[model samples]
Target: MEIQFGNQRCRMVNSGGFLATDLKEMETDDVLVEFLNIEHQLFIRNIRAIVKIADTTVLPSASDKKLLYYVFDETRVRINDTPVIFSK
Candidate 1:
């Protein structure tokens, strides 16, 4: 998924699992404002270089909520493993 920070930006490989070892490039000064996932977590990357809150990042935010509304509105995303219904 493409994401936008205040100014700088970057892209990601969107699908499949990424390895922590492979993401060693995250240590650089590049501004990677994008959405992505690794072996164990789904997270968003931005200008700041800090992360890690918990094991699972359950959800998403206002204009942020609208962004999600646009995504889930006509998409077929579903995660029945959790309680809420995302999509068909």
Candidate 2:
């Protein structure tokens, strides 16, 4: 999913789901970096706790947070209190 925050654009990728029709599984470090560096803040929302199965899943997969901060470029991004980029 793509959303606009202020002025930056970010891509949100879903993971850990059953195979569905018309779905493409993709996402890589390079791709993420490219999108993130485009002055867009990637927003990863709509994390549900229920899966197709009767099992419980955390709203956010650890992978999400991992990638959320993992940067592809050296550019800095700081939206409100999110996506804090360490600077000197």
Instruction: Go through the candidates in order and give the clash count of each.
Output: 1, 3
Clashing pairs in model 1? 61-65
- State the lDDT of candidate 1 residue by residue for 1-88, as single tens digits: 3222223132345431221311233334443223344553444433332322233332432223311111222122222221211111
C-alpha RMSD of each candidate structure in angstroms = 13.5, 14.8
In candidate 2, which residue ranges exceed 4 Å CA deviation? 16-88
Model 2: how far residue 14 lies from native, Å:
2.1
Positional deviation of residue 48's Cα in model 1 after best superposition, in angstroms: 6.1
Provide the TM-score for each candidate, comma-separated: 0.25, 0.19
Model 1 segments more than 4 A misplaced = 14-26, 29-41, 44-88
